[PDB]
Amino acid sequence: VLENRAAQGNITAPGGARRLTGDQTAALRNSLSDKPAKNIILLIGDGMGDSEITAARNYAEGAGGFFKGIDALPLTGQYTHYALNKKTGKPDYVTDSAASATAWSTGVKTYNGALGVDIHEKDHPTILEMAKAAGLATGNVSTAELQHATPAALVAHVTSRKCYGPSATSQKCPGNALEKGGKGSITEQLLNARADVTLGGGAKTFAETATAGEWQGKTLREEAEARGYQLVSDAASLNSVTEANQQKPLLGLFADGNMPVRWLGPKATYHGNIDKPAVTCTPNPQRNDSVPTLAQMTDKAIELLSKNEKGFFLQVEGASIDKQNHAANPCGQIGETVDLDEAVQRALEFAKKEGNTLVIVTADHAHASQIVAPDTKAPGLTQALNTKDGAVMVMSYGNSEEDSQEHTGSQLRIAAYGPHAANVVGLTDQTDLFYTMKAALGLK
Active site residues: 97
- Shortest distance, CB of residue 354 to a second copy, whole angstroms? 20
Report the candidate in 181, 179, 125 with the shortest Cα–Cα distance to residue 156: 125
The site for a second copy, by CB under 8 A, has a size of 106
- Shortest distance, CB of residue 148 to Zn ion, whole angstroms? 9
Contact set for a second copy, span 313-342 (CB under 8 A):
none
363, 44 contact by CB (below 8 A): yes
What does 266 bind: a second copy, Zn ion, none (CB cut-off 5 to 8 Å by kind)? Answer: none
Dihedral class, residue 442 (left if φ above 0, else alpha if ψ from -120 to 50, else beta): left
Count Cβ atoms within 10 A of the Cβ of residue 376 and give its class: 0-12 exposed, 13-18 middle, 19 or more buried.
middle
53 contacts a second copy (rule: CB under 8 A): yes
Nearer Cβ to a second copy (66/206): 66
Nearer Cβ to a second copy (69/184): 69
The whole-angstrom separation of Cα 14 and Cα 4 is 19
Q: How many CA atoms lie within 13 A of 438 on its CB side?
A: 16
The whole-angstrom separation of Cα 170 and Cα 75 is 45
Contact set for a second copy, span 367-396 (CB under 8 A):
368, 370-373, 376-380, 387, 389-391, 393-394, 396
Which segments of 132-184 are extended strands (E)? 137-145
* Strand, helix or coil for residue 391: coil
Dihedral class, residue 365 (left if φ above 0, else alpha if ψ from -120 to 50, else beta): beta
- Which of 214, 289, 401, 403 binds a second copy (CB under 8 A)? It is 401
- Which of 37, 39, 45, 47 binds Zn ion (CB under 5 A)? It is 47
- Which of 37, 40, 45, 46 binds Zn ion (CB under 5 A)? It is 46
Nearer Cβ to a second copy (284/400): 400
315 contacts Zn ion (rule: CB under 5 A): no
What does 197 bind: Zn ion, a second copy, none (CB cut-off 5 to 8 Å by kind)? Answer: none
93, 409 contact by CB (below 8 A): yes
145 contacts Zn ion (rule: CB under 5 A): no
**Which range binds Zn ion by CB under 5 A, 107-115, 301-309, 319-327, 410-418?**
319-327
Nearer Cβ to a second copy (2/241): 2
40 contacts a second copy (rule: CB under 8 A): no
Sign of the dihedral defined by the CA atoms of residues 59, 62, 64, 66, in that order: negative
The whole-angstrom separation of Cα 249 and Cα 243 is 8
Contact set for a second copy, span 107-146 (CB under 8 A):
107-109, 118-119, 124
Nearer Cβ to a second copy (85/246): 85
Count Cβ atoms within 10 A of the Cβ of residue 107 and give its class: 0-12 exposed, 13-18 middle, 19 or more buried.
buried
Contact set for Zn ion, span 361-390 (CB under 5 A):
364
285 contacts a second copy (rule: CB under 8 A): no
349, 418 contact by CB (below 8 A): no
* Strand, helix or coil for residue 242: coil
413 contacts a second copy (rule: CB under 8 A): yes
What does 364 bind: Zn ion, a second copy, none (CB cut-off 5 to 8 Å by kind)? Answer: Zn ion
- Shortest distance, CB of residue 423 to a second copy, whole angstroms? 5
**What phi, psi does 209 have (nearest 5°)?**
-100, 140
196 contacts Zn ion (rule: CB under 5 A): no
292 contacts Zn ion (rule: CB under 5 A): no
The whole-angstrom separation of Cα 197 and Cα 253 is 12
Q: How many CA atoms lie within 13 A of 185 on its CB side?
A: 26
What one-letter code names the amino acid at 149? A
- Shortest distance, CB of residue 322 to Zn ion, whole angstroms? 4
Nearer Cβ to Zn ion (92/364): 364
- Shortest distance, CB of residue 5 to Zn ion, whole angstroms? 24
| Beta strands 230-232 and 250-253, pairing class | parallel
What does 47 bind: a second copy, Zn ion, none (CB cut-off 5 to 8 Å by kind)? Answer: Zn ion
How far lies 266's CA from each of 276, 282, 284, 328, 331, in Å?
A: 11, 10, 11, 9, 7
DSSP 148: S
Nearer Cβ to a second copy (89/277): 89
Contact set for Zn ion, span 84-113 (CB under 5 A):
97
What does 97 bind: Zn ion, a second copy, none (CB cut-off 5 to 8 Å by kind)? Answer: Zn ion
Can you name the residues that pair with 263 across neighbouring β-strands? 283
- Which of 39, 80, 296, 333 binds a second copy (CB under 8 A)? It is 80
**Which range binds a second copy by CB under 8 A, 43-51, 184-192, 253-261, 327-335?**
43-51
78 contacts a second copy (rule: CB under 8 A): yes
C-alpha distance across the termini of the chain, in Å: 30
Chain positions contacting Zn ion, by CB under 5 A = 46-47, 97, 322, 364
